[PDB]
Amino acid sequence: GTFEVGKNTFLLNGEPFVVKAAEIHYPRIPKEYWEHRIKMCKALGMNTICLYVFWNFHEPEEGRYDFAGQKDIAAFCRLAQENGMYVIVRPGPYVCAEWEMGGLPWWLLKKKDIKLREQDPYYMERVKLFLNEVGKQLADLQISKGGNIIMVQVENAYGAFGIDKPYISEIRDMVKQAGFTGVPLFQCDWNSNFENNALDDLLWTINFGTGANIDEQFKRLKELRPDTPLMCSEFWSGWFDHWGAKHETRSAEELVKGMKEMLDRNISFSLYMTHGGTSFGHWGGANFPNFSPTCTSYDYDAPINESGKVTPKYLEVRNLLGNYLPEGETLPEIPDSIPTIAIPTIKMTEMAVLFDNLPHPKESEDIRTMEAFDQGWGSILYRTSLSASDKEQTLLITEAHDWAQVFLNGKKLATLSRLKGEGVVKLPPLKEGDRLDILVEAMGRMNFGKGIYDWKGITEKVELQSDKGVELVKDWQVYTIPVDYSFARDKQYKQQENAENQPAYYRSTFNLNELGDTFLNMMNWSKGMVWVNGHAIGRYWEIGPQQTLYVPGCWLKKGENEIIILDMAGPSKAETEGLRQPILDVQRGNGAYAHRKMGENLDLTNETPVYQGIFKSGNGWQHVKFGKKVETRFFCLEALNAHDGKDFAAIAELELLGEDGKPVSRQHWKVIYADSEETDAANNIATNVFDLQESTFWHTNYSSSKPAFPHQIVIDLGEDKVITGFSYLPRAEAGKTGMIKDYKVYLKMQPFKI
Ligand SMILES: OC[C@H]1O[C@H](O)[C@H](O)[C@@H](O)[C@H]1O
Ligand SMILES: [Ca+2]
User: What range(s) does the F5/8 type C domain occupy (predicted)?
Assistant: First the structure.
């Protein structure tokens, strides 16, 4: 067969063909259910499956490649072929995907000066070798060799990382050298950045979300390439969740409207995610703002939910896609759901306290990261002894990646979270030889932007601060606590209760006479991870919004089953249970879910704006130069009205421009104040202005208080910076509220009055 880029169309075996693809991810779906999920995608109206290849899933240790069982990507593609569906493969080497390090293997970071997603010779050689392995698995499944693979993506959304055409060209060449020479190669990006890395000989595709202004997404592309076929390579069907935040949803009605608009113009798309599944085990990622780890669940509000079930969105999409079939044809029947069971209360009566079950220590004079000790995943304990002190001191940990508990002679003093930028602990007076323990749990490595440079453990150093000065702390005992099931199983379990909330493994067995999917209730538990019959189910955290872990019935057995829970901070009750429905929407954070509280009223009365302006109407980036340089710690944008004359303001992204006229780093930014936020009907929290996601936005309240203009957002830059201008991106939809018109900008060194 053939697949070709034609004149305003794709051609499948010489005939016009509109790609209607479903994104599903083989590691996020138990292998026993691959067929069921593919059949769900076919019944929805799709003709193609789109998938990433996840490098770190196949080469978790250097030189050791695995493509068996759950990792059998060729078997996955053949299953799609057997069900009459084409495949698009996106082999990376970086895939983002809310997945550990964006698919990159942690062991790259053993080279401390490595450069990632650039032509670093060590990185590039490992990429070459990995792609070659993918080629041996998949090149013979190109449509041109009798298989079903129709296109291959080169890299992934490089426009959101940098500008490096020689890099992308070399990746393209490595994809070809691996054997992918028979089908079109393409690169994806946003409508705002695709030109930066666009190569003459690749197809250019665009990614955007439910509700986007479709014409705006493709207009510039058609000025450059009047005859290119148009494809949305990721049409976001929903969104992912962050630990501590609200469960995300997106409108089915809006999705269908955009899908219809594309299909009425024969525009191709791949729906991301069509079924998301679960980031099982340690494989979940982390992204912006700051460090924001993503939930274990990848339900995504996709049409096919986490456990493979029909949703109202599925039914709306199917109703639409049923009208776009070659004449005569009807959609296949929707597969039956996989049965569910409830599992009665499981009492976790056996426990092995972590600090009483430690491995052999490595002695290290200096702090080093976990990768320096040949550890990629899990937790790491750093232990030392301290000198006598009659006065209190401060312990400075620089920096804990990601969630550290500090103990003194076994008594917990504090918890330090990277989500909160924490690194300081007050120590009481010390006796000579007092034992300091810093247990650092590593969550996923960041999967987006420059966050992929994510070394775990303590990144640099530990210091003691007294009135005398600051002293580096040396002479450590280091204990690797790996995620391997074998490590969790090999512990001295005893019938015991956790009086002191110490980190511990908990074990129980339970009988089952009939099997089905279930949802393990973690509401009683603190933070940690779970194994069921050896299978690593994923991470949990009491802050939510996710409170249940999906447990596939194919990982349960008749007769005796085993559950082990690693719980870091102690459960409120040492019991769990299996529910027939998940809990995905229960937050239990510290403080109100808002950037304004009682008694806060921003007062601009004695402030003079740096700039007053008017934004243009409609969609797309706007860049503003102030014609001067201002040293800034705090930035306030005061929106005065909107283009529609209504009471709401919204912002998708804000950047501030430095002395060189380019965006400053937002790594350390903080929203100090937003006058109003919608957090009930949607998750339009104010940090959405710096998550590097053009599909997410801050929006003022509309569901209850619905306050009028003026509206304001105040940002702490986290450091003093010389600012020359700023950039504003409104929400991506057409015809919606909150398109700011008149505005003022204020820049200060001292705090605003709030
Ligand atoms: O879900 C958000 C989405 O963002 C980008 O489009 C990436 O290419 C995807 O891998 C995914 O991370
Ligand atoms: Ca955003």
Answer: 652-754
